Ligand binder design. Structure first.
Ligand SMILES: Cc1cc2nc3c(=O)[nH]c(=O)nc-3n(C[C@H](O)[C@H](O)[C@H](O)COP(=O)(O)OP(=O)(O)OC[C@H]3O[C@@H](n4cnc5c(N)ncnc54)[C@H](O)[C@@H]3O)c2cc1C
Ligand SMILES: NC(=O)C1=CN([C@@H]2O[C@H](COP(=O)(O)OP(=O)(O)OC[C@H]3O[C@@H](n4cnc5c(N)ncnc54)[C@H](OP(=O)(O)O)[C@@H]3O)[C@@H](O)[C@H]2O)C=CC1
Length: 515
């Protein structure tokens, strides 16, 4: 028996555990397949893995002593250093004693008679808990490309989410399939280390400099002396990235002033910076969006000296969705040991024991093939657990057509289950989102103990109202276009307003059952 069972020991699960156990004095246990805390920062150890947000903001804000203790080595934070940070949090707050590692959760069945959850591990251990906290993260299973013959390759073959230790590059012919955020980081990190790199690019994306530099002790002291204001700015912002979020319309300035503004963001670095600190309508107005595209295309054409390679790297679509950042990606294609293959024009048709074959018949001989090919969507982590709520309905069936929820935290037919960083949540920096949701969920659970409520559930109507709120917001944006509604796009500040109104109005939209 527990008051709460938590699935996941990444950012979301660790704070779920600390808040429910130490601040609300509940009996809690968390579970993770991993052998150690860290979640995605434990699993993803590929070359060049790097935070998207600056080091001093990609962290918890709720422990002020930790903030002052913060190691801030570079402007952005590498995977080993995030993993080390989350280990330090677990150390300081004595968290591991209530985490069962190497334990996958196979099923969780809601017991409507007793109003609690029966949770079964993959080793057939059964646990019961009033509440179920799912902190499963944004990504499901790794997606491997479906390519004829991929199982015949005799060299090294890895998805980036299963990067083995001890990989060496010297003397090897290496291929990378995928040029999203992960592929860009891997390619930039390994091109100088391999004998030859072939990049297999299906769709060129826009990338801006991340500007990752060492942080002086003065840089760090200024941050730490001003940390309360820094966090106040996060809670008052749409993105939580520490940006000066612009309201300036792109076309309201001259051509010369617009170039200076883009160039300032480009030199400072950061994807959200380039998209949202420059001007206020890049994601909203097509004409503004085209000015942003053209600035980046001109940078590509200046960096990449061969115009035919530059052309191949140049996208043909909107500057939209989460912005990409790099530490020297376009420069890589000037190297004599790098080949770019456009596999939209020249598709991969076969993999054999020693090569990737393209449609022109060319055998690209490889010692190593890296699949930076992405992951299944967020709801897959939910559908891969056998979660059965009211009347035995499964989340596979409930979400056949995509995820829908109330506030991103509650699913109709699934009572006493609360999602952390779940679908239909905000587009912002994740740790502020997780802290916002964990604190809301925990206050609701505390309210239920105070008012002797034993079943909490969102109504179908509140879920559908949330879906409409997200749909209305997203349809004012070019993100609705470009490459159920998966995200709420109103920003962190308005998200916190939205959920505060719900808690201030006796949890409108939630069915509360007394006993
Ligand atoms: C290189 C990289 C950089 C990033 N940078 C940023 C950034 O700057 N800003 C940002 O906002 N986001 C960023 N992200 C996104 C990142 O996912 C989030 O920031 C955050 O770490 C997610 O934490 P989480 O605890 O919610 O989920 P995760 O860290 O994914 O943890 C989920 C855990 O649940 C476990 N789990 C799932 N199903 C089961 C089951 N059935 N049984 C047991 N355990 C289970 C998994 O094993 C996993 O350990 C980045 C991601 C990567 C890979
Ligand atoms: N890595 C990071 O630093 C961060 C990552 N994230 C998120 O992580 C998620 C995953 O990023 P990523 O790992 O880059 O995965 P993505 O899904 O973003 O990119 C997948 C890449 O592989 C290509 N690809 C997929 N299948 C094939 C195929 N069969 N043949 C050829 N090419 C193929 C895609 O091309 P096409 O575009 O043509 O499909 C794309 O280039 C994204 O949502 C990203 O925003 C979040 C924060 C930071």
């Amino acid at each position: 028996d527990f008051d709460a069972i938590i699935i996941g020991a990444g950012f979301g699960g660790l704070y779920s555990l600390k808040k429910l156990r130490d601040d609300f004095n509940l009996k809690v246990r968390a579970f993770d397949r991993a052998t150690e805390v860290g979640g995605t920062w434990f699993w993803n150890q590929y070359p060049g893995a790097l935070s998207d947000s600056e080091t001093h903001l990609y962290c918890y804000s709720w422990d002020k002593e930790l903030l002052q203790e913060m190691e801030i080595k570079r402007k952005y934070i590498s995977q080993p250093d995030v993993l080390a940070y989350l280990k330090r949090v677990a150390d300081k707050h004595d968290l591991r004693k209530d985490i069962q590692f190497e334990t996958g959760i196979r099923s969780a069945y809601f017991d409507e008679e007793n109003s609690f959850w029966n949770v079964t591990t993959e080793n057939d251990e059964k646990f019961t808990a009033r509440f179920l906290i799912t902190a499963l993260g944004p990504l499901s299973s790794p997606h491997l490309p479906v390519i004829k013959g991929i199982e015949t390759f005799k060299g090294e073959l890895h998805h980036t989410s299963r990067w083995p230790k001890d990989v060496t590059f010297s003397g090897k012919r290496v291929g990378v399939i995928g040029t999203g955020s992960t592929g860009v980081q891997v390619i930039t990190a390994i091109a100088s280390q391999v004998k030859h790199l072939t990049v297999f690019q299906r769709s060129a994306q826009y990338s801006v400099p991340i500007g990752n530099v060492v942080m002086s002790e003065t840089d760090v002291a200024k941050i730490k002396e001003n940390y309360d204001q820094i966090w106040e700015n996060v809670w008052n912002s749409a993105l939580g990235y520490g940006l000066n979020e612009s309201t300036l319309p792109t076309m309201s300035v001259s051509a010369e002033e617009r170039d200076k503004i883009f160039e300032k963001a480009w030199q400072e670095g950061g994807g959200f910076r380039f998209m949202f600190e420059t001007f206020g309508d890049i994601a909203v107005d097509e004409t503004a969006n085209i000015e942003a595209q053209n600035f980046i295309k001109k940078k590509i054409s200046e960096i990449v000296k061969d115009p035919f390679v530059a052309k191949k790297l140049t996208p043909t679509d909107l500057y939209a969705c989460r912005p990409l950042c790099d530490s020297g990606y376009y420069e890589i294609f000037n190297r004599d040991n790098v080949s770019l293959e456009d596999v939209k024009a020249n598709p991969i048709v076969e993999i054999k024991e020693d090569c990737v074959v393209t449609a022109d018949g060319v055998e690209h001989k490889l010692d190593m093939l890296i699949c930076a090919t992405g992951f299944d969507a967020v709801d897959g982590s939910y559908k891969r657990i056998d979660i059965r709520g009211k009347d035995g309905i499964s989340i596979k069936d409930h979400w056949k057509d995509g995820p829908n929820s109330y506030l991103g935290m509650m699913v109709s037919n699934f009572p006493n289950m609360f999602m952390v960083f779940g679908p239909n949540g905000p587009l912002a920096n994740s740790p502020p989102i997780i802290e916002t949701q964990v604190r809301w969920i925990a206050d609701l659970i505390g309210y239920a103990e105070d008012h002797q409520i034993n079943q909490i559930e969102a109504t179908k109507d509140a879920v559908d109202n949330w879906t409409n709120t997200c749909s209305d917001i997203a349809n004012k944006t070019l993100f609705a276009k470009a490459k159920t509604v998966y995200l709420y796009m109103g920003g962190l500040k308005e998200y916190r307003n939205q959920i505060s109104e719900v808690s201030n109005n006796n949890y409108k939209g939630c069915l509360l059952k007394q006993s």
